[PDB]
Design a protein around this ligand. Structure first.
Ligand SMILES: Nc1nc2c(ncn2[C@@H]2O[C@H](COP(=O)(O)OP(=O)(O)OP(=O)(O)O)[C@@H](O)[C@H]2O)c(=O)[nH]1
Ligand SMILES: Nc1nc2c(ncn2[C@@H]2O[C@H](COP(=O)(O)OP(=O)(O)OP(=O)(O)O)[C@@H](O)[C@H]2O)c(=O)[nH]1
Ligand SMILES: Nc1nc2c(ncn2[C@@H]2O[C@H](COP(=O)(O)OP(=O)(O)O)[C@@H](O)[C@H]2O)c(=O)[nH]1
Ligand SMILES: [Mg+2]
Ligand SMILES: [Mg+2]
Lengths: 407, 272, 433, 431
């Protein structure tokens, strides 16, 4: 009834998308071959959102895997769940100019033909989701081009991009501020939801709250894919208070230039303290409003929160959730704005994730990302023909709008 | 040693998935290749099973699976074949049966089950299901891995809690028929025990109400000689045998509070 | 012969109807399959008999999102409803009045009026409408806005009776609920006749201090709302001493055409363990309706004044105890009536006691009463909602989502001035001589 | 048709009131479940149609650990589950905590129960509030409880049963501070208030009941028998039945002198009374005897104003007349010259009953006295000296002023009690 088209750009986007497909596949009970295995009919009531039924009950993802290098393509194909994908949806061929003007200018015809075919085969399409990073040449140059072309073709749709954001300490590329500054220009204009992911915040979450000694890139991607599934479980599973992507967008976008969001996953706990800690709604609220659970190198104590939403999974009451949100908004009164009453939004789904009684996913729109934008601007200006100046101008406009709405 | 997925999904230490992605990919690749080869070569699933079972015992063994993969052009390690065999054998009886062969090594939905397949036992009567709801076509049951048992995991709150298919009363009644009426009523007493009857009865009274005889005197039980002298003074002259018959009928009409005046009059009216 | 129709729009209206329609099946003894047991004119308001003996309810279930109506379609009551009265759409309304009224709401309402036309043809006598929704949602606001203006044109002077979810003063589940509430009640003022009001935060404290339910759930809320609506229409299905028709409590409750928003109060709501200890008489349950704790809308009735009340009883009651309890109330100085309504109490008596739902939290009592009160205290309730509107509209926030579908900006300014006129109407009527 | 409402505030009030309700249930033959296996129970119990009976009692306290033993103990099934009101963090023997900060939180819930209990009432005789002077909750909460019951109920009777702070034995350090503040507000919001003290009950339990080690369980059994004797003219028939308003008039000569002393006779063991003969003309001689007085004071130092004799059991009016006229001819038992008649007699028919495990005996007749004497002037002259010594250096004042009290109200209560002392000397002198 409602469908989402998935696009995978860049190496990091490919890995995160593959982990997403694994997570939702074993949440929906799909064999890596393609057969269905599960006791619950609610796994098969809504399978046309992400999957297409082939002949004989085989299900194939509705994703397009696009890259300029065969190495990552072969890695995803030889990965654990790589054989489920469509063999025609693998389209393959560090500079933003290479990704947007010279080498990526010819593959996008073959990209958009397959994307248009998969959109035409859908009954009543709802939206797009694209996974990439802002610091890679391919993941920026091809990503912004695909966003621009899809927004030109389909005006009245919802689009969610999941972008891995540059970090100050863990950065491994030198053209990182250049690529970020060149990509925010297109991500501020033709985007309905941007989701910021920081690998430094991922490392700190793996270090402090979960106590990992050797965090693997797959373990970093699993935590992102859990939040990616949690933000969209309300389109696939029945709930007590349902809210789809457009219901999230209308509530959480006050002005068209403020749609960059910090996400969160809230039942996180290590093996040592699992018996010592009980899990219910109030301490789920405590963990999800905890600042160390945040997904970016931004500190919420510095700024102010415009709009916050929480999607819950599992069997729980609603009076507890309403009391929890009212109480936390009353205790933290200076941390929310005063010209918008009722900054909190609650959605509750009747289905918890794998191996857990309940779960909580946090999503936030706050002024704290203005520091994240300013640090990239300051890193770019020291290393820094007219489009660079225009990009710096629009970043300055964005942080000025954040400051004038914060104060 | 545990990753982040085990921590997130609270998985048991026996079922940790760190360090097995390569072997899961290899099992999936060999599984899909065998399914593709089976569909391309054998048009009948029973024929494919009979080709795979060379010894004819109805079971598939590890050496038979080695020979089958050698025929199907796959070079497998012994560890890989043992792990794939353990994946295939859900029931842990050391043998691959028809059901999990058709569910893990072959496409069970592309080849529809036919009359000869039903006639040819390898399958149980519980192994046949309808293909889909409201359809005459029949297929095989889907064996489930122990990882994917989610029946108690997913349940809807609203509809399932609401699903209802269609202790003594607590409070005070308007008419206090449960409390027996006191012998003498206090002036402050106002509660209705039921003796205050109809407005018709108070307006136009019957002869008992005029002369003081009421429902309490009607329903009060009496003694044998008292009923005898009451009947004798009325003048309804009865012999002792029919008097005892009337007494027995009045006792049988209601065991508790027996032989009341209303019961005796009802018995007499029924007999007359 | 007396027959009424019920429409459930949006998630909040439909989900109450799941709890509402099972209470009618329990009261009349109808199985979910749709037939009476093998081992009557009391079920004709809500059910129609077929030739085979199966009973079919008169309800239309309309929602623009398929994820909620399909729960009924696969639920335990799939064998009861009409398969063509279950109408569904796609891609909901996203908490937007623009999608529920202007763009997506126009692809459905041609089929919706087809269903209402068919049920009105089978009706020997039609008495009123029963629409269930919430103000905060986009579908609950957008879709019911254009629904009356098709129905009120189609049927001229038939009564229309809502039971809508008031946004709570403190707790809320969305951010544009102050926007969606204003645009709804701009249109119900001249197209409805009586629009009853309940909210969520008042029922939460009912479950805490009366039923001792520390964790109330939406299943518990909808059963208690379902008992009120089953007590409103109980004088149309059963026999009683003082039967109240839909048209005759509409006259007594609406003194002026723009003052038609009464509050619903139910009594007694107690658990199982308290009913053994407590003695519930006629004079106590009617005084259980007037305390400041036990109103089902979050407002203080002591600030305002009562205009008209409707005390609808059930079960083993007698009229002498009712009239003696009323004259006790009028001498109390806490309850203040306006001086231009010397007689403001209307009473209805029914012979059928309340029916306990198995597995529920409510107790079973010989008698219960539903109190409907038209009072001026809800003007301050609307004052908080207008104050919510003013601070959000002062910077034109959440507007470009509204104007992207076809709605103009000028409707927001002309709906706000209607509400300031409505609040001063309560100030005009409460000022005495 | 005559019934009363009993409120039990504080640990002293509740634990005494715990001991009262076993005595009340055994008078009418009702199990602790509350169901019987005749309108005598109408004074204290309201019947439910299932056969249950609910007492007309509201147990209120700010501590959870004193009411939770009622919800757990063997009288769990008897009371209403929500009549038992529970606070938190008590008052900690602070009059300012139980009156200005913590007592204001629950009083709306407390007075709600009084409204609901009195609406089921068809005719009300008065209230029975149990408390103590020493504690913060038993004094601070009762002060605001009583001041708003006067503006809600106009001229309804209100009888307090207070534990008077004994001269020698005491448990609290700021106990003299609480009693001075308690009297200042209660003097204008009550009708009668009967006191006993812990010191006199200790000696009566020793020299009469032969108990070497009395405990607080045994004291409340004797106190509950006195309050059972006062109410028994309402529940049962008798030759001379006294209403609560009858001795409300007959014991208060002036609007400020309303502090009687209530003593009991005979209180002796089962082994002792087997030898003795108990008659009407001798049980009342032990009433005037100074070692049987329930308050630690000297009756011979003061002069009587009025007395109330409530006989129970098998007594005759001829025997009382010889008993009363004997006393008025004697010398050292002194009555004031402006009050020629000073006695009221109450005759009742049902004798007192015995609880299982009790220490009192089964006597055919028993008498409870209510005496209003001038002897308690020295009892208050002593308390003002205790109040003055600590207040001269301003000790334990900074705790009271921390919760909202001001320094001036400690002073203003002092001359009010000083005005109370000179009122006895004003009326004690003959004319
Ligand atoms: N009493 C009750 N109210 C509910 C229930 N579900 C939702 N609501 C109320 O509905 C209000 C908002 O409406 P929605 O839940 O969004 O449903 P809707 O009116 O159809 O709007 P959309 O979902 O956008 O189509 C919330 O503020 C809730 O208070 C329920 O099950 N019971
Ligand atoms: N006769 C009698 N007196 C008691 C009993 N229990 C306590 N008291 C008296 O109560 C006085 C102090 O009051 P508390 O028992 O502490 O209760 P309170 O008055 O509410 O004071 P707080 O505990 O501070 O709240 C003591 O000095 C005792 O004399 C009892 O069981 N019988
Ligand atoms: N979470 C996650 N991030 C990754 C992974 N591999 C690379 N990255 C991030 O991606 C950034 C570099 O992007 P890059 O691979 O050059 O983008 P591309 O050139 O378009 O493929 C680095 O800052 C890394 O933090 C991965 O496996 N997981
Ligand atoms: Mg909805
Ligand atoms: Mg205490």
């Amino acid at each position: 009834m409602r469908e989402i088209v998935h696009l995978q750009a860049g190496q990091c986007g490919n890995q995160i998308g593959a982990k997403f497909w694994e997570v939702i596949s074993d949440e929906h009970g799909i064999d890596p071959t393609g057969t269905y295995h599960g006791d619950s009919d609610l796994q098969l009531e809504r399978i046309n959102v992400y999957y297409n039924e082939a002949t004989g009950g085989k299900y194939v993802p509705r994703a397009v895997l696009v890259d300029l290098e065969p190495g990552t393509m072969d890695s995803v194909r030889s990965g654990p769940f790589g054989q489920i994908f469509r063999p025609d949806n693998f389209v393959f061929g560090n500079n933003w100019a290479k990704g947007h003007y010279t080498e990526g200018a010819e593959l996008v015809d073959s990209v958009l033909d397959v994307v248009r075919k998969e959109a035409e085969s859908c009954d009543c399409l709802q939206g797009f989701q694209l996974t990439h990073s802002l610091g890679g040449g391919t993941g920026s140059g091809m990503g912004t081009l695909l966003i621009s072309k899809i927004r030109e073709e389909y005006p009245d749709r919802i689009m969610n991009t999941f972008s891995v954001v540059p970090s100050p300490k863990v950065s491994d590329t030198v053209v990182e501020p250049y690529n970020a500054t060149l990509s925010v220009h297109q991500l501020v204009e033709n985007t309905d939801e941007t989701y910021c992911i920081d690998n430094e915040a991922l490392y700190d979450i793996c270090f402090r709250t979960l106590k990992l000694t050797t965090p693997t890139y797959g373990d970093l991607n699993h935590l992102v894919s859990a939040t990616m599934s949690g933000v969209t479980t309300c389109l696939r599973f029945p709930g007590q208070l349902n809210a789809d992507l457009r219901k999230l967008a209308v509530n959480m976008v006050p002005f068209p230039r403020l749609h960059f969001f910090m996400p969160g996953f809230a039942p996180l706990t290590s093996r040592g303290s699992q018996q010592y800690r009980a899990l219910t709604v109030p301490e789920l609220t405590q963990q999800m409003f905890d600042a160390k659970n945040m997904m970016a190198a931004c500190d919420p104590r510095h700024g102010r929160y415009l709009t916050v939403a929480a999607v819950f999974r599992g069997r729980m009451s609603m009076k507890e959730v309403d009391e929890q949100m009212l109480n936390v908004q009353n205790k933290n009164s200076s941390y929310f704005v005063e010209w918008i009453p009722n900054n909190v939004k609650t959605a509750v789904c009747d289905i918890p994730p794998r191996g857990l009684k309940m779960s909580a996913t946090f999503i936030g729109n706050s002024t704290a990302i203005q520091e994240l934008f300013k640090r990239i601007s300051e890193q770019f200006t020291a290393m820094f023909e007219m489009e660079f100046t225009e990009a710096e101008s629009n970043m300055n406009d964005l942080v000025s709008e954040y400051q004038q709405y914060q104060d | 040693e545990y990753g982040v997925g085990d921590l997130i999904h609270n998985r048991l230490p026996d079922e940790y998935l760190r360090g097995k992605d390569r072997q899961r990919a290899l099992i999936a690749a060999v599984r899909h290749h065998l399914k593709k080869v089976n569909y391309q070569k054998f048009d009948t699933l029973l024929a494919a099973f009979r080709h795979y079972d060379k010894k004819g015992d109805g079971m598939i063994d590890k050496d038979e699976l080695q020979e089958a993969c050698d025929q199907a052009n796959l070079s497998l390690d012994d560890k890989l074949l043992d792990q794939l065999f353990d994946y295939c054998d859900v029931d842990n009886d050391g043998f691959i049966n028809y059901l999990e062969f058709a569910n893990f090594l072959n496409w069970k939905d592309k080849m529809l089950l036919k009359e000869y397949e039903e006639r040819v036992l390898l399958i149980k009567p519980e192994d046949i299901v309808l293909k889909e709801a409201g359809s005459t076509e029949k297929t095989l049951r889907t064996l489930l891995r122990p990882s994917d048992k989610v029946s108690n995991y997913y349940k809807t709150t609203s509809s399932e809690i609401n699903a209802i298919v269609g202790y003594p009363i607590c409070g005070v009644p308007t008419i206090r028929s449960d409390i027996p009426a006191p012998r003498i009523r206090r002036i402050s007493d106002r509660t209705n025990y039921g003796e205050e009857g109809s407005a018709y009865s108070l307006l136009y009274p019957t002869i008992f109400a005029r002369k003081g005889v009421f429902e309490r005197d009607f329903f009060k039980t009496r003694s044998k000689e008292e009923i005898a002298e009451i009947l004798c003074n009325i003048g309804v002259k009865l012999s002792d045998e029919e008097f005892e018959n009337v007494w027995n009928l009045a006792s049988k009409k209601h065991h508790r509070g027996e032989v009341c005046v209303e019961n005796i009059r009802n018995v007499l009216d029924e007999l007359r | 012969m007396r027959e009424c129709i019920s429409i459930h729009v949006g998630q909040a209206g439909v989900q109450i109807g799941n709890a509402c329609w099972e209470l009618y099946c329990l009261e009349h003894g109808i199985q979910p399959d749709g037939q009476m047991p093998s081992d009557d004119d009391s079920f004709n308001t809500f059910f129609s008999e077929t030739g085979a003996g199966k009973h079919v309810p008169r309800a239309v279930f309309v929602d623009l999102e398929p994820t909620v109506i399909d729960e009924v379609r696969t639920g335990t009551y799939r064998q009861l409803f009409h398969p063509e009265q279950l109408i569904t759409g796609k891609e909901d309304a996203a908490n937007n009045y623009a999608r529920g009224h202007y763009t997506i709401g126009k692809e459905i309402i041609d089929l919706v009026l087809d269903r209402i036309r068919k049920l009105a043809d089978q009706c020997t006598g039609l008495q009123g409408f029963l629409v269930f929704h919430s103000f905060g949602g986009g579908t609950g606001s957008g879709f019911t806005s254009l629904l009356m203006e098709r129905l009120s044109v189609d049927y001229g002077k038939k009564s229309k009776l809502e039971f809508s979810i008031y946004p709570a003063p403190q707790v809320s589940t969305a951010v544009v609920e102050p926007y969606n509430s204003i645009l709804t009640t701009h249109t119900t003022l001249e197209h409805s006749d009586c629009a009853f009001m309940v909210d969520n935060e008042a029922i939460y404290d009912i479950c805490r201090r009366n039923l001792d339910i520390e964790r109330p759930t939406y299943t518990n809320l909808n059963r208690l709302i379902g008992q009120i609506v089953s007590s409103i229409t109980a004088s149309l299905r059963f026999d009683g001493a003082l039967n109240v028709d839909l048209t005759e409590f509409q006259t007594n409750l609406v003194p002026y055409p723009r003052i038609h928003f009464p509050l619903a109060t139910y009594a007694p709501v107690i658990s199982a363990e308290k009913a053994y200890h407590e003695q519930l008489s006629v004079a106590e349950i009617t005084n259980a309706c007037f305390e400041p704790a036990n109103q089902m809308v979050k407002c203080d009735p002591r600030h305002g004044k009562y205009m008209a009340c409707c005390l609808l009883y059930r079960g083993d009651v007698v009229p002498k105890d009712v009239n003696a309890a009323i004259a006790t109330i009028k001498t109390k100085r806490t309850i203040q009536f306006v001086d231009w309504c010397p007689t403001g109490f209307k009473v209805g008596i029914n012979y059928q006691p309340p029916t306990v739902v198995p597995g529920g939290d409510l107790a079973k009592v010989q008698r219960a009463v539903c109190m409907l009160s038209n009072t001026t205290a809800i003007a301050e309730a609307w004052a908080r909602l207008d104050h919510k509107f003013d601070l959000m509209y002062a910077k034109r926030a959440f507007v470009h989502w509204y104007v992207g579908e076809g709605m103009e900006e000028g409707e927001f300014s002309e709906a706000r001035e209607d509400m300031a006129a409505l609040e001063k109407d309560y100030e005009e009527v409460g000022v005495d001589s």
